[PDB]
Amino acid sequence: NAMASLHIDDIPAAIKAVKQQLRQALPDYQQVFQAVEENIRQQVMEIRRNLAEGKNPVPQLHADDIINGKVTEEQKAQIKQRGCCAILGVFPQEKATAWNREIGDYLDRNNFVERLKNAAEDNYFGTLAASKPQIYGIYWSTPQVEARQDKRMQAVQIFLNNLWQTESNGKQHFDANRVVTYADRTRRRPPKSSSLGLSPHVDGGSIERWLDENFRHVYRHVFSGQWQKYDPFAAEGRPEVREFPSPAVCSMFRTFQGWTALTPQRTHAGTLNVIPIANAMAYILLRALQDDVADDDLCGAAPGRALSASEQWHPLLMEAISPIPDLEAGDTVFWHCDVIHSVENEHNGEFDSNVMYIAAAPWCEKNAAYLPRQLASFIDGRSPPDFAADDFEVDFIGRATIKNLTEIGKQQLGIT
């Protein structure tokens, strides 16, 4: 709400006032930063050493091993330190491959490209926002609806949500054993194509991480100097954070963002890059408080945009950028909501690199509040409320409906 009432042109003054308060509460902000920096440097060295050894620094598990409860305590600790995980064989390869063809048909038959070109204005900006598109405002294809409700996928999301410390001061901040569905888009990157994608960033808020008292509570051990107590997997306070209202706001708390692979994923073939450092955010928060940063500036952090990590202000973090592991169709990869990530710039592969966005979102009040309005958009075939009201699929042939839904899918979408 406080964020909801702050004008976009009052932000620089907001930042100036709040930065003074944080430097005053944490007078040794420099020494704390240097201590945090050393902890980060040690994670970076280890990641670079993994890469140099030919090991991918992103942890990998088999869905079967999750389902059968064979994941060891050391593996869970590794995932929590790296803040990410690739999970293989969630779906059979045959199914995912068919899913890929089906989404393609779905787009082909309903003339998506032609519709996108029409929905764009004659601006330079509009027009190849509407040609060679890579992210598709497509939400209700049967493969998306089937993928979200699958039992294996549910077990994997429950596993991941249980990595969090969900209980604090007598209160359950979310139910890790209960999954709700967050409908999202699908991406299809052609070989040899350029990238529109954002540079290394984190979704879920930018300036607000400093300006909002609720975000600052999530990060209380960072701003008080007790950085060793900061825990990225502590749930407390995260479903309560306030964001500047914008198209970048997600209505749901997601513990992990996720990709489900519809095609093989390879390095240098349009795959995902991450910085696998779960507590990188502490470095970023503290970085913006140093003396070499202007008073009304937070290292470029800006309204209505994902928080960016740059070579300019965070060259240490950039040293730890890594491609995700190779994936086959039916594999997945997940990353903590605070993990820095980025689509790689170039795709020199032979075929389209295609994925569905499918996150892990646990049951909680915040997330429960979004379900009814999301359900309405599903019922209508409209774009969900967190997205541009393109509403492409209202009249699409073969759009998925309530009748494609299992009982799991029904409960995850808030149909009782």
Enumerate the known binding-site residues for Mn(2+): 201, 203, 341
Closest approach of Cβ 3 to its own copies, in Å?
Answer: 9
Between strands 60-62 and 84-88, the pairing is: parallel
Contact segment (CB under 8 A) with its own copies among 39-47, 250-258, 291-299, 371-379 equals: 291-299
Query: 145 near 404, Cβ under 8 Å?
Result: yes
Footprint of its own copies on residues 329-348 (CB under 8 A)?
A: none
Closest approach of Cβ 139 to its own copies, in Å?
Answer: 18
- Per CB under 8 A, does 416 bind its own copies? no
DSSP three-state, residue 161: helix
Query: 170 near 164, Cβ under 8 Å?
Result: no
In the list 297, 319, 326, 328, the residue contacting its own copies (rule: CB under 8 A) is 297
Q: Comparing C-alpha atoms, which of 353, 328, 341 is closest to residue 91?
A: 328
In the list 22, 67, 113, 129, the residue contacting its own copies (rule: CB under 8 A) is 129
Residue 187: strand pairing partners: 135, 355
Task: Name the strand (E) or helix (H) holding 125.
Answer: helix 124-127
**Helix and strand totals (H; E) in the chain:** 16, 16
Query: 179 near 258, Cβ under 8 Å?
Result: no
- Per CB under 8 A, does 312 bind its own copies? yes
In the list 225, 303, 323, 409, the residue contacting its own copies (rule: CB under 8 A) is 303
In the list 10, 28, 365, 395, the residue contacting its own copies (rule: CB under 8 A) is 10
In the list 67, 98, 248, 408, the residue contacting its own copies (rule: CB under 8 A) is 248
Q: Comparing C-alpha atoms, which of 126, 176, 135 is closest to residue 156?
A: 176
Query: 361 near 348, Cβ under 8 Å?
Result: no
Give the separation between CA 319 and CA 117, rounded to whole angstroms: 39
Give the residue with the Cβ less far from its own copies, 43 or 134: 134
- Per CB under 8 A, does 6 bind its own copies? yes
In the list 50, 142, 310, 411, the residue contacting its own copies (rule: CB under 8 A) is 310
DSSP three-state, residue 307: strand
Binding residues for its own copies, how many (CB under 8 A)? 44
DSSP three-state, residue 338: coil
Both tokens assigned to 413: 């979408």
Footprint of its own copies on residues 188-207 (CB under 8 A)?
A: 196-199
- Per CB under 8 A, does 5 bind its own copies? yes
Give the separation between CA 404 and CA 143, rounded to whole angstroms: 10
- Per CB under 8 A, does 125 bind its own copies? yes
Contact segment (CB under 8 A) with its own copies among 43-51, 241-249, 262-270, 379-387 equals: 241-249
Footprint of its own copies on residues 55-84 (CB under 8 A)?
A: none
- Per CB under 8 A, does 123 bind its own copies? yes
Both tokens assigned to 234: 């502590």
Contacts with its own copies by CB under 8 A lie at 1-2, 5-14, 16-17, 121, 123-126, 129, 196-199, 213, 246-248, 292-297, 300, 302-305, 308, 310-312, 388
